Design a binder for this molecule. Structure first.
Ligand SMILES: Cc1cccc(O)c1
Ligand SMILES: Cc1cccc(O)c1
Ligand SMILES: Cc1cccc(O)c1
Ligand SMILES: Cc1cccc(O)c1
Ligand SMILES: Cc1cccc(O)c1
Ligand SMILES: Cc1cccc(O)c1
Ligand SMILES: [Cl-]
Ligand SMILES: [Cl-]
Ligand SMILES: [Zn+2]
Ligand SMILES: [Zn+2]
Lengths: 21, 29, 30, 21, 21, 29, 30, 21, 30, 21, 29, 21
């Protein structure tokens, strides 16, 4: 999810916007 | 369980900035 | 718990801490 | 909403918890 | 102390209030 | 010594929110 | 992205996130 | 500068990026 | 060092950084 | 106190250090 | 790459406080 | 650099000021 994807490696703001709304 | 917990503190602050007025959900499992 | 205006990032951090494993929803402005 | 309750006014802990899932 | 207790695993706000005052 | 140091940054911000007007001490050893 | 005044530490955090591997320069006041 | 653009006024993402290296 | 109002969480973060291994005491309001 | 010195007014580094243990 | 990324979030907030009006650069490589 | 020096071990504010300007 966001934690598996963005805590192992860096999520850019572009990656992170996927999780908006 | 801190490293993921500490990571999530940053993630929520980042999502705040990126999503702005759209907002977001923060939950899993 | 604080008796404070909590806004922007501080509001989200507070929800994050307060809600624990439930997680949360942030609407920003309604 | 949360912004209008806890940012423009001050919320209690209990009030803040209404925005938990 | 707080660091041994709350950096290895998660302290909730309830756990953390123990360290107030 | 960062991971504990970085952890303590979050802990102090958390204690600020939870203790509010009661305040707190942050020290050991 | 937020439509907010971003000041002090929040401004730097925003630059940090926005700029990624490029990094950034913070002048503070000019 | 960044402070006068994004703190005293509000900056867009694009505006914020002018301060990246 | 900054010439800024430091309040709420920012004040605590500043004390945390400034005080190092001594640690600190935060009264909030007196 | 610290709040009245450094939040309502501005404190120096030296002033901030009075609240270290 | 998070631990260094998460570390850098704190470093930039620390440099903000310490450098104040002098400011700073944040980049390498 | 700052990351090798201050993420492995703690940099004090004194250490960190080296990286100002
Ligand atoms: C901005 C950010 C914070 C935490 C983890 C990430 O991958 C990205
Ligand atoms: C990833 C995750 C798990 C459990 C609760 C949460 O808020 C987030
Ligand atoms: C809120 C919080 C921060 C850091 C560690 C913890 O266990 C809990
Ligand atoms: C240390 C480092 C590497 C690459 C980009 C940066 O902003 C910082
Ligand atoms: C846990 C710990 C050790 C040393 C200094 C501190 O402020 C906190
Ligand atoms: C203040 C600070 C933040 C992050 C790493 C450090 O070594 C020091
Ligand atoms: Cl603020
Ligand atoms: Cl961290
Ligand atoms: Zn703030
Ligand atoms: Zn962190």
């Amino acid at each position: 999810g966001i934690v598996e994807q963005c805590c192992t490696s860096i999520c850019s703001l572009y990656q992170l916007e996927n999780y908006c709304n | 369980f801190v490293n993921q917990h500490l990571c999530g503190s940053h993630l929520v602050e980042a999502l705040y900035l990126v999503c702005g007025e759209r907002g977001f959900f923060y939950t899993d499992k």
